[PDB]
Design a protein around this ligand. Structure first.
Ligand SMILES: Nc1ncnc2c1ncn2[C@@H]1O[C@H](COP(=O)(O)OP(=O)(O)OP(=O)(O)O)[C@@H](O)[C@H]1O
Ligand SMILES: [Mg+2]
Lengths: 342, 117, 52, 136, 284, 52, 86
């Protein structure tokens, strides 16, 4: 209960209009959660672009153990044709339990926590099917019917820890398989910080190569600025009457951490994220130091959506960044501060 | 189900305010322990009293607990619960003792016990 | 009077801005009211149509 | 001009270059110009007028003190609180009472209080020794 | 043992280490602010001691009780101590030195009296049974002179009233940012000036109103600054000692982490094997 | 110097009087935008439900 | 686990209390009786509630014991009252 399924199905909804097809595999979910997920997927218009594979909590363990492989095959169909798919496995840490059950019922020897010996080779041979494949492979597979396309399949497996002990068995296997982790911290989630992503401990090892240029330029500092803000604000509780230099870092960090949290079913395009991060990074928030800052974000988005839609189109289509676009964004922020209200 | 969209903003705000007051009191408890209470700031000396009254008011006598205590039980509607906590947090009852809230039903019983106390 | 004019300009700006904010929150509320009315009409419409 | 210091037991109050000053010594008002002869006196609680060279005038309130003037230099050893036969005896009376009883106050370091209580609770009951086999 | 029981204590000791690091930082900043406030206090005592030397050891040397060595039959001490713990051995070294000297004085059969600055010495000497007669406590980081007026007034009155003789101040001298030494120093009878104001020959002050009633006030104000100076030096010494002590405590925590993690590793290995052996041996 | 003070005071008061009118006109613009988009959604969601 | 699940309550005897001289070394708070006052004479039921609350406040304050003489007097009274009940 820290927003894993919410983050996953919001990542699905955001693919309404990209070339990416979506697949959602639910392993061990209770039927009411699947009913709500399907209602939300068709409400926000994303259902027409996604496959839902269901193995509910009450179905035989064989159906739960083999569900993610069926989902992976249904997405690999698109991968092999030179298209893009994104597949979300909901609770692989429950596929492992269903496999443990089916294994013990066949008297097979156990391992570290009774999970069978090949439990690593359970997730590995799954997540190694999430790949980007070169144009020659798809050309040869499809027997020459597609030439320029490169296919890909993106996997977002979900893992549930107990009291945040990352070093457990299945979590430390899957962390050894994947290329990064979005660690969601429970004490941030309960404090209203949602999504509760924890900087520092969370990384993407593919990284900026997969980031559009404008986002890469704007976001370079944020992660380290936030981790150092968190450690400094941990120090702060014991130190009242503290240096006025850190007094500013401990406030900019406190504003950026208050900016990076948003409603649940409200995905935000690259332009809307980009100009908000521009406002936050280039000091335009330094005078809103009263935390009436959600209204500031909403009013800035509405203002830019009314007047400068031709710039949002350029940002969304190209993702490029220029000194000319820098000046355009300076102009937008200056005209917004001077003439509107939060 | 505790979010504004299903419980309404009034219920959500009352609950979050109760939790915030109790968290602030749990913070102040050790400054009180070390430096004594007469050192707290006059708004913190009020957070203390309001949290201490909240912490009493959300106890309750059950109809089935009577065989353990002899006192009669009370059933409290959600409207009276929100009205009571929302009143306490806003200072409408800063004039009552703390024991006026212990093991009472609706806030009317709190005012009537203080009037009796 | 020059510094009083400074303070007058700033107070006038902030008064106008806090005066705009009440117009906006008003629009937000109207919105919240009219969308609730629309949802309720849709719900009753569904009830009758499905009963038919 | 001459150099003037206004110094309290705690911190300094004025260190500029001055052209003349005026004070209320215990025996009457008194004006110090440059080259004044060496002089020593007490000064009563009240204002003192400094005129910095280039003629800039300012007023400093003093709770009393001792004024001592030298060839080309002058200093005001200002008191930090009003002093008197009765006030100091009242303070000494309270200082004695607090010792004849055993009444003690609370220091204002809320930061030390927070950290000390946090460390007292964190270190409590953790049975580390006899968990690790450390003899000592 | 138990793997979870040991991981809980590892977490507790890590939290303790973090708290002690924060305390070290806070103390290392307060030390700088305090030792600058310490330097802001020199000019008063210096420029007043020159005057006292002129009126006392100059020409027409005047006569005052505080300047001359009447015979000693009981002694008095002003004791400065911290209001806060965790300062290491600071206070107890000083109290033990004071007890050594105060016992040497009572070997000769003289009586002794105490005045306490700070709560810690007040707590200590009532347990030892010392004869405290005046006290001020709760100074914290903001030591006023207008609060030291009281007990210093008590000791001065007891001196000139004829009861006390040869009173002392005991305090910690701040010498280096990691070196502070407890010192007992003599304030009255006035210690002897190293310098000579024979060179002041060539001038004399125009004493208004009159020199004796003025030297009295000068001497009273002077002991006060020197005490106040002792209090502020003791406070900077306290900050430096707390810094060093929390440094040491953070390193001790950092070693307990190593030991507890070795124990946790052994415990979790034993748990894995004890479970898997039961499973495998249970299958007939 | 006083004839500079009058010029500056009048100029800055004119600036602020322009700013206030601009701010409140944009507030009314935002109100119109909010209300018209609420009117649009009041039909979008009703049609969604009545087709569901 | 089985027997703690079956019975109506538990009396936990601890060695750290036994060594310190607290005998019988029953650990209150950690020890429960679900029959409670229903199995007491009304005089004992009357008198026991203040002992329960005194030891509960003492358990809350006990962390500060080895930092005592730093504490306020109002909590010092609770701390040295719980010791006398024990
Ligand atoms: N960004 C957000 N803002 C507000 N509320 C949120 C947000 N994300 C999630 N929530 C709320 O938190 C609750 C838990 O969300 P969710 O079910 O996604 O977490 P989870 O980890 O998948 O739960 P579990 O894994 O325990 O089934 C949901 O009811 C949802 O309404
Ligand atoms: Mg979930």
């Amino acid at each position: 209960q820290t927003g894993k399924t919410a983050l996953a199905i919001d990542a699905i909804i955001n693919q309404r209009d990209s070339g990416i097809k979506c697949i959602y595999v639910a392993i061990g979910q209770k039927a009411s959660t699947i009913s709500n997920v399907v209602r939300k997927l068709e409400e926000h218009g994303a259902l027409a672009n996604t496959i839902v594979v269901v193995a509910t909590a009450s179905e035989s363990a064989a159906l739960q153990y083999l569900a993610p492989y069926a989902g992976c095959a249904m997405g690999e169909y698109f991968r092999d044709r030179g298209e893009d798919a994104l597949i979300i496995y909901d609770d692989l840490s429950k596929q492992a339990v269903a496999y443990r059950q089916i294994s013990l019922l066949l008297r097979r020897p156990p391992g570290r926590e009774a999970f069978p010996g090949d439990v690593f080779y359970l997730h590995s041979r799954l997540l190694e099917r999430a790949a980007r494949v070169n144009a020659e492979y798809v050309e040869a597979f499809t027997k020459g019917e597609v030439k320029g396309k490169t296919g890909s399949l993106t996997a977002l497996p979900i893992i549930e820890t107990q009291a945040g002990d990352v070093s457990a068995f299945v979590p430390t296997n899957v962390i050894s398989i994947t290329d990064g982790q979005i660690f969601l911290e429970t004490n941030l989630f309960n404090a209203g910080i949602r999504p509760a992503v924890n900087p520092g401990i969370s990384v993407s090892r593919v990284g900026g190569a997969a980031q559009t240029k404008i986002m890469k330029k704007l976001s370079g500092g944020i992660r380290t600025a936030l981790a150092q803000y968190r450690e400094l604000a941990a120090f702060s509780q014991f130190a009242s009457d503290l240096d006025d230099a850190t007094r500013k870092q401990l406030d900019h960090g406190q504003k950026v951490t208050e900016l990076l949290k948003q409603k649940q079913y409200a995905p935000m395009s690259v332009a809307q994220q980009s100009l908000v991060l521009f406002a936050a990074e280039r000091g335009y928030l330094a005078d809103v130091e009263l935390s009436k800052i959600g209204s500031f974000e909403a009013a800035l988005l509405a203002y830019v959506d009314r007047d400068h839609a031709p710039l949002m189109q350029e940002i969304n289509q190209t993702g490029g960044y220029n000194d000319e676009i820098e000046g355009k964004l300076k102009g937008i922020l200056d005209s917004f501060k001077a003439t509107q209200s939060w | 189900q505790l979010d504004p969209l299903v419980v309404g903003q009034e219920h959500y705000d009352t609950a979050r305010g109760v939790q915030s007051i109790l968290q602030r009191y749990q913070e102040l408890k050790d400054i009180i322990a070390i430096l004594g209470m007469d050192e707290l700031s006059e708004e913190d000396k009020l957070v203390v009293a309001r949290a201490r009254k909240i912490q009493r008011f959300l106890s309750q006598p059950f109809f089935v607990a009577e065989v353990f205590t002899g006192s009669p039980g009370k059933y409290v509607s959600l409207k009276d619960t929100i009205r009571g906590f929302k009143g306490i947090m806003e200072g409408e009852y800063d004039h009552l003792p703390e024991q006026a809230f212990y093991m009472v039903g609706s806030i009317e019983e709190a005012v009537e016990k203080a009037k009796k106390l | 009077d020059l510094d009083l004019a400074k303070a007058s300009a700033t107070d006038q700006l902030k008064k106008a801005k806090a005066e705009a904010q009440v117009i906006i929150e008003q629009a937000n509320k109207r919105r919240s009211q009219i969308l609730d009315e629309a949802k309720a009409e849709a719900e009753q419409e569904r009830t009758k149509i499905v009963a038919q | 001009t001459y150099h003037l210091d206004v110094v309290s037991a705690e911190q300094q109050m004025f260190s500029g270059l001055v052209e003349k000053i005026q004070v209320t010594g215990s025996e009457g008002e008194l004006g110090i110009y440059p080259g004044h002869a060496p002089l020593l006196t007490a000064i009563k609680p009240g204002m003192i007028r400094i005129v910095k060279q280039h003629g800039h005038e300012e007023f400093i309130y003093l709770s009393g003190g001792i004024l001592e003037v030298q060839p080309g230099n002058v200093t005001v050893l200002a008191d930090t609180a009003i002093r008197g036969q009765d006030l100091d005896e009242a303070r000494a009376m309270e200082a004695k009472r607090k010792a004849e009883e055993h009444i003690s106050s609370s220091h204002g370091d809320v930061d030390y209080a927070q950290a000390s209580a946090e460390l007292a609770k964190a270190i409590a009951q953790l049975r580390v020794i006899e968990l690790t086999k450390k003899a000592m | 043992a138990g793997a979870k029981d040991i991981r809980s204590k590892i977490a507790s000791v890590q939290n303790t280490q973090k708290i002690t690091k924060a305390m070290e930082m806070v103390a290392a900043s307060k030390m700088r602010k305090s030792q600058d406030r310490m330097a802001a206090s020199r000019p008063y005592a210096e420029t007043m001691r020159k005057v006292i030397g002129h009126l006392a050891h100059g020409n027409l040397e005047y006569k005052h009780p505080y300047l001359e060595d009447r015979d000693v039959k009981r002694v008095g001490y002003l004791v400065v101590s911290t209001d806060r713990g965790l300062a290491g051995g600071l206070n107890i070294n000083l109290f033990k030195k004071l007890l050594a000297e105060m016992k040497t004085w009572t070997d000769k059969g003289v009586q002794a009296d105490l005045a306490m600055i700070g709560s810690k010495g007040v707590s200590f000497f009532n347990s030892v049974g010392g004869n405290v007669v005046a006290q001020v406590t709760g100074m914290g980081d903001n030591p006023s002179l207008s609060e030291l007026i009281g007990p210093v007034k008590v000791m001065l009155q007891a001196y000139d009233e004829g009861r006390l003789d040869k009173l002392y101040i005991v305090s910690n001298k701040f010498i280096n940012t990691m070196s502070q030494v407890p010192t007992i120093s003599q304030l009255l009878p006035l210690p002897a000036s190293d310098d000579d104001d024979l060179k002041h020959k060539s001038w004399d002050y125009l004493y208004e109103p009159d020199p004796k009633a003025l030297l009295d006030t000068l001497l009273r104000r002077y002991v006060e600054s020197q005490v106040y100076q002792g209090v502020v030096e003791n406070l900077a010494s306290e900050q430096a000692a707390r810094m060093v002590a929390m440094k040491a405590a953070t390193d001790n925590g950092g070693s307990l982490i190593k030991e507890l993690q070795l124990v946790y590793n052994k415990a979790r290995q034993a748990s894995i094997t004890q479970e898997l052996t039961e499973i495998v041996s249970g299958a007939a």
